[PDB]
Amino acid sequence: SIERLGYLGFAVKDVPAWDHFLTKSVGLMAAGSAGDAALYRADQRAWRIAVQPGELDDLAYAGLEVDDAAALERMADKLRQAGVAFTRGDEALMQQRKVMGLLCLQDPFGLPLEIYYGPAEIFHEPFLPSAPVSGFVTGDQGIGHFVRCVPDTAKAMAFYTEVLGFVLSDIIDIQMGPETSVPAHFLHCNGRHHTIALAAFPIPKRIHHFMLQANTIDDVGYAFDRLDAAGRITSLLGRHTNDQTLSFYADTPSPMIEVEFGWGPRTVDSSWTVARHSRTAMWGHKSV
Amino acid sequence: SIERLGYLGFAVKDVPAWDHFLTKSVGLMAAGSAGDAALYRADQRAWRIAVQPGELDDLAYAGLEVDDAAALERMADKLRQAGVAFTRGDEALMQQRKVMGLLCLQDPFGLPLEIYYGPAEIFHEPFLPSAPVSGFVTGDQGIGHFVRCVPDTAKAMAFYTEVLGFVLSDIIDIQMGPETSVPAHFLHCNGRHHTIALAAFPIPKRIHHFMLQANTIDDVGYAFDRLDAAGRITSLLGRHTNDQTLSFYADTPSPMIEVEFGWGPRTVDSSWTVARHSRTAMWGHKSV
Amino acid sequence: SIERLGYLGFAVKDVPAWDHFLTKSVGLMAAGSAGDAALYRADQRAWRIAVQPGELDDLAYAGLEVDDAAALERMADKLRQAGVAFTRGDEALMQQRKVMGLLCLQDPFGLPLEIYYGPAEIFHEPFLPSAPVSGFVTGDQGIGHFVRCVPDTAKAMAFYTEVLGFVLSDIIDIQMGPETSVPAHFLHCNGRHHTIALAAFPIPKRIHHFMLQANTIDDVGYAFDRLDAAGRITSLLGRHTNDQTLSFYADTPSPMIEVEFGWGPRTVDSSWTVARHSRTAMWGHKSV
Amino acid sequence: SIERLGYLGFAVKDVPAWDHFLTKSVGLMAAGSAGDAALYRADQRAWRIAVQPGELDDLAYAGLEVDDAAALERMADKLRQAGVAFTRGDEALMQQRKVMGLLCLQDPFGLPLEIYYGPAEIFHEPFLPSAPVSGFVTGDQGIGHFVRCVPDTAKAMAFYTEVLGFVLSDIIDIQMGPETSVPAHFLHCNGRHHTIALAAFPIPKRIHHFMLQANTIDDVGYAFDRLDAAGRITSLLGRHTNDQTLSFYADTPSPMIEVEFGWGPRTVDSSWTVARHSRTAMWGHKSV
Amino acid sequence: SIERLGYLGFAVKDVPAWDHFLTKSVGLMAAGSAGDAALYRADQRAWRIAVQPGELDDLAYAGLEVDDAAALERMADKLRQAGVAFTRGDEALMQQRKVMGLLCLQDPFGLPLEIYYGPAEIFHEPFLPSAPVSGFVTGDQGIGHFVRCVPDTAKAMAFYTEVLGFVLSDIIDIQMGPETSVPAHFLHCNGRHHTIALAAFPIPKRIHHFMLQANTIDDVGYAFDRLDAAGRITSLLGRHTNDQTLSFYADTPSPMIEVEFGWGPRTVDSSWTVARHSRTAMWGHKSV
Amino acid sequence: SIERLGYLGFAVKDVPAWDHFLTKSVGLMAAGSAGDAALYRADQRAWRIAVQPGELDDLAYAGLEVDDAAALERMADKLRQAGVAFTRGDEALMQQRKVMGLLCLQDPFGLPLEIYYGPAEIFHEPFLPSAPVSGFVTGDQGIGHFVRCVPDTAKAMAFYTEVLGFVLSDIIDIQMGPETSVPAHFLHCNGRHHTIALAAFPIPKRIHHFMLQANTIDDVGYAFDRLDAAGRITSLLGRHTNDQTLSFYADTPSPMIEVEFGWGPRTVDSSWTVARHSRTAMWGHKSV
Ligand SMILES: Oc1cccc(-c2ccccc2)c1O
Ligand SMILES: Oc1cccc(-c2ccccc2)c1O
Ligand SMILES: Oc1cccc(-c2ccccc2)c1O
Ligand SMILES: Oc1cccc(-c2ccccc2)c1O
Ligand SMILES: Oc1cccc(-c2ccccc2)c1O
Ligand SMILES: Oc1cccc(-c2ccccc2)c1O
Ligand SMILES: [Fe+2]
Ligand SMILES: [Fe+2]
Ligand SMILES: [Fe+2]
Ligand SMILES: [Fe+2]
Ligand SMILES: [Fe+2]
Ligand SMILES: [Fe+2]
């Protein structure tokens, strides 16, 4: 079973715009480069987000983390049993990602996934944000979450839960029109209420947004003003019905992909109960 | 010395509008009437806000509280020494306000003030809000605060500090134009960062707004949506530079008088230091 | 200034009934005798309540405590300045009361008061209740409180506050008839919300009741059942509007004198505010 | 006013016996010598107890500490006003005691007292006990306490309270015979329930005992066994009625002078109340 | 009485070197300029340290803060009574320093001091360090401390304590040679163990060093490595005997002026006791 | 599975030097002898470190602890299944080691290991350090850790994890030259981040160092100065990247074997994640 989401790689048309966005607006720390990919940090890991030039303007891959070598072999066993194709990353890839081992595969709809273990940490180069943010909530909960767009939620659910070991937290019927709603399924693989949400949205992107969680409410408030100064705000502040994350949304430089920046959600444990919600926000989140 | 702000009375042109506003939108509890004044509660006091019909569309009076009978006589002594005219409230007024004694006077610019002691409490009729609000922060800090508009800040400061015993917390230069700012003076008389702020604003109202503080951030979030549904929002959520109150503003039914609804400020004590700020918001509070 | 109420002495027609009442029902510890007075303990003091035979069926005296010898002399000075007659207790009385010194006087309406210091404690004979009670709340707050009946509340207030140093906490208008109420004044001399309450009740007793405070709510619950088994209950459980004590009342063997047995009130400090209440109970206390 | 007891000096006939006693049995740290005086530490101070050869076999002097230079001059002023003779310690004495200034005087019955300020600390030579003891409770409460034998308690009380600023905590009537008791007066000058107790005992020593307080109950338990192995125990474990110190007593090498080694007493503050006790122990302390 | 040390201004020969030093090595935030002075922040204040070109290579002035306007006038009164010359800062200076009022004077040996109130804060531009540091401990304790070199400690003590209201914490005899020591006097004006220390050192600088206190021990550890990479370390890590600050020292670009960077000292209150120490370090601080 | 590391035995050429080193410098308590082995304590166990004369100047054996008799038999079963030779310790050895049972074996490269249960404790002889140290962190985490030098890390890993039940925490690539690094594997068997680390170092010793963890940072600071006075320091203070232990290193009297003395690491639990680090220190640890 996947333990947490550890990294994201984007392929974008405007690297300089993404660079400014991730550092000056979001607050991530610039962390050099690996080949043609620019690297960004949010904590002690050598990198958390990679940005490389490309026409996709989308998520290129997502790194799914396990706790040790044996766990990785067990995942390989699960993939084999499920008939899911995969390739072991070679030395060059391991060195590029800074991991001790990885399996390369795709989800049922073409998103490359990399299951890995043994990521590099660099405590001798302590994290220093590029903008005022006290810090990000990562650790055992991983880097954050993202919404995976899919054409068949049922099929997507079978793969993420039966193969990768994610678990359903809850469902929100997200209103699309006067008489049309999309049942978004929010999935956890640790204490983070959701690490991946599945939704049949009509957008031409692999993902709808990625989310980062900051330590304080002020972190979120200040970030709002920075993104507003950049003219990127897509929602006012609000708080979600399901995880109680207080956040706002903004456009990334890649069309139709947003970032969510939030604080203070509830966490999940073994006693979690599946529920359904008719709205995404308990309050706020008006679209701008 | 005044211990806290205990009550506010408004004279307005649309009582039904104010009634709906205070109950369904703000969350106060309807508490009957006393003569032609409708009464509203925020806690265990018999009333905190009174609304009566009148062409003023403004604050008619403010109740300033002291802790006992001797304290009231000491205030009478201070008023006499300062040459400030006042009248002792008669039995009819005491019965109307539900207090054991009061002194009626005006500030240097015509706002009626009532210094009182011994207010009525009704614990046998526990507070029940008219809208979802976990509760208000009152107690020793009083009902909240208001911004007193004045034509001469220096003169106003001498009266409120030298006569009534308020103390300056800090000053914010509130930008009015490209090269014009108003030095707002925020005053305390207890732990509440400010109970009265003095400002030379060019509006034709005795006050710019009154403020209520709720127990939780969700209280504020939910209230925002209620006031937005009523079409009354004047500012987005934000957090102040001086008291760190997280709030939003909305129009009352009386033109040019707003309400501020907030949470989580810092409090003051004997070790407080006077400072100056160039902005009212550390983040947010964009005008709408 | 009086620091706390330390002891009470009753003169009663049925000593055996009072003995059973204080021990088997209330839970006090039998502590021998001193002359014709039976002694009862509630904590580490050698005694707290004394019961002696007499036709009064009433409170014979109340012991008011100060912290040291100098404090006692200062009280003697206050009594002299106020023109209040008093006599220094002789060795025999000091030995009888187990105190290092005392002043004997009366309040304006004939209740004997004894101001003392240096009471005897007996930690080598640890308190053991006669009925199931985890313990009583005494210490700096003294033994409890009592309601002093007076024919002139104003006169009584001047003596207790101006001479003895008690301070008004609040007032409750206790309804006596359809259009008649008695303004009961509750006074403190330490953290205990009230140690003495003054009221112009039409009963022929020096006091309306005395009160003891137990450590837990169960203490109160169990005591209710014991007093109910004895057929003495006068009120159901309830909670007061002013001090938030949760209690019930019961008859003592002396006609028209009750006992109040309670738990969990709020305490007072320097920031206390005088208020007025129209009811004695926020909930409960129905008369039985 | 004296702030705390800081040091004790003994003049004894058997220095080696005292050396072994203070180190191997009590647990103090050997700290070299100053002239013919051996020094012992209990914490960060350069020394706390001094032992020098002499026929007295008794306390030679006690050091009473104040917080600064001005405080010392104020004490000199009090001594002058009271007619108490004193001499300012010269440089040689200051250097010997390791203090910034001192006044040498005697109590009314010949015990030399030294009022000082600015004691030497040696944090670069951290305290290391000579026997298993987690540490001693000193700090603002000073080194411990002692019982001062006096022929006239009233006279002694006037000096210690009126001149030195000590305050009475309480009195215990210590039984000497079938119909004879000694009223011991326990005095504080800080949070320590008592720093000096005054008693008219019929022993030929300036003091009855000195006391040290350890951090844990085990400290006391282990110390008991060490002193028992040395054949010095004079009392079983017990707990005092007045300060609730749990301790035992043992003989020092000087006849009729004991040491008390204890733990866990209650402390005093401004709200302390004078009381009287008929026993020294709530439990235990049987004489051996 | 001075409440805290609020700012420091240096006049130096190598501004670029100081700029790099304060930002990349120490971690302060660059905050623009005011005239020919570069400004640096450590928290919410508009500035804390100023650096301007000059041949002094030394501290040009120190800002001493009070809590309000009345306090400033009271300081002016103290200066007048003491015969100390001073000039009220004009509008240009007030605007330059960003304060509501100030008095300009010098200490007895020529160090310019500025007593001020009403400093500017900029919460809308949250502090962002230039190097990895979780934050600095300032607030009521002010910016940090400095060691003031003086030729006459007695004279310096009279001015700082009798005129400015500082209070002696303790003294350390700092060894200079085999038989020569300098009695350094550490002074407080708030909870910070020392804000100014006075010492008769034989260096040709107004100050020996200034000190900044960080939130964590890691902050100090990481800063050590940064300053070591710059070749500026003058002492190994160590902990002081008097305040228990754990720190290290490094050279600033101005010859013979160092910076101390530390964490975790003890704080002082009304119960503080003057003591003397023979060493500056309980452990560590070896000179490099 | 091994539960913790309980004891270490060294065979050395200079017993007196080791004796002084372990007591006066490190702070261990001398605990007599057993045959030709000198014994040393760090807590309530009868002994933790043994030193005997021998030409090895190295670790002679390490004691690996299990919780009960059944656990020991289960370990014997694991050794048999794995084909690892072992001998049950006879009565003489059990008596020498003070254990209820033990199995004697060697790791793949000749280090004798003893798996035991039922160690002797001596609470009646409470631990007393020979130098100032508040205490050591042992308990369920065992005595500390050591770095086991091995010529084949893969082979060593298979034995320690597959046979003894240790688990990999993380890996650090320890730089040996400009283009050469050694992958050190840190292993846990309880909450202690590592109890044994495996590394292919080119030194001629069975171990690179052993480590003891003290209760406070001051413990470490003071120990540094003691070892520096002895001329044994090999590293400055620093903090590790993987366990966050703050420590320093020093030479033992046996050439090329060091001691690490530290404080405050993070602990591990079931949710631990394997990671890789490029440095041993987040800060400090410069070689001396
Ligand atoms: O973290 C989250 C929690 C709940 C809902 C959303 C969501 C809202 C709008 C569109 C897609 C998802 C979300 O992002
Ligand atoms: O509570 C408050 C704290 C700081 C500023 C304001 C304010 C803002 C705009 C206009 C008037 C006042 C305020 O209300
Ligand atoms: O403790 C108390 C607090 C408030 C009211 C009463 C009271 C009620 C009925 C009659 C007399 C007093 C009381 O006893
Ligand atoms: O600390 C103490 C507290 C109470 C009593 C004693 C005492 C007992 C016997 C003889 C003298 C004093 C004591 O030492
Ligand atoms: O903060 C401090 C506390 C104690 C001593 C010093 C000090 C040490 C060497 C030279 C000058 C001062 C210091 O800086
Ligand atoms: O406890 C530890 C944690 C991390 C690294 C080391 C280490 C450093 C240098 C050489 C060998 C090991 C260590 O001792
Ligand atoms: Fe989301
Ligand atoms: Fe406001
Ligand atoms: Fe009552
Ligand atoms: Fe004693
Ligand atoms: Fe310093
Ligand atoms: Fe190590």
UniProtKB/Swiss-Prot annotation, chains A, B, C, D, E, F:
- Give me the reactions it catalyses: biphenyl-2,3-diol + O2 = 2-hydroxy-6-oxo-6-phenylhexa-2,4-dienoate + H(+)
Return the InterPro entries for the record: DiOHbiphenyl_dOase (IPR017626), Glyas_Bleomycin-R_OHBP_Dase (IPR029068), Glyas_Fos-R_dOase_dom (IPR004360), VOC (IPR037523), Xdiol_ring_cleave_dOase_1/2 (IPR000486)
Top-level EC class as recorded in UniProt: oxidoreductase
Give the top-rank taxon of the lineage listed in the UniProt record for this protein: Bacteria
Note whether Oxidoreductase occurs among the keywords: yes
Q: Which UniProt keywords apply?
A: Aromatic hydrocarbons catabolism, Dioxygenase, Iron, Metal-binding, Oxidoreductase, Repeat
Any one Pfam family here would be Glyoxalase
Q: Which molecular-function annotations from GO does this UniProt entry contain?
A: biphenyl-2,3-diol 1,2-dioxygenase activity; ferrous iron binding
**Pathway annotation from the record:** Xenobiotic degradation; biphenyl degradation; 2-hydroxy-2,4-pentadienoate and benzoate from biphenyl: step 3/4
VOC domain location is: 4-118, 142-264
Q: What positions does the entry give for Fe cation binding? A: 145, 209, 260
Annotated family: Belongs to the extradiol ring-cleavage dioxygenase family.
What NCBIfam families does the entry give?
23dbph12diox (TIGR03213)
Quaternary assembly: Homooctamer.
Can you name this protein? Biphenyl-2,3-diol 1,2-dioxygenase
* Protein's organism: Pseudomonas sp. (strain KKS102)
The organism's taxonomic lineage, starting at the top: Bacteria, Pseudomonadati, Pseudomonadota
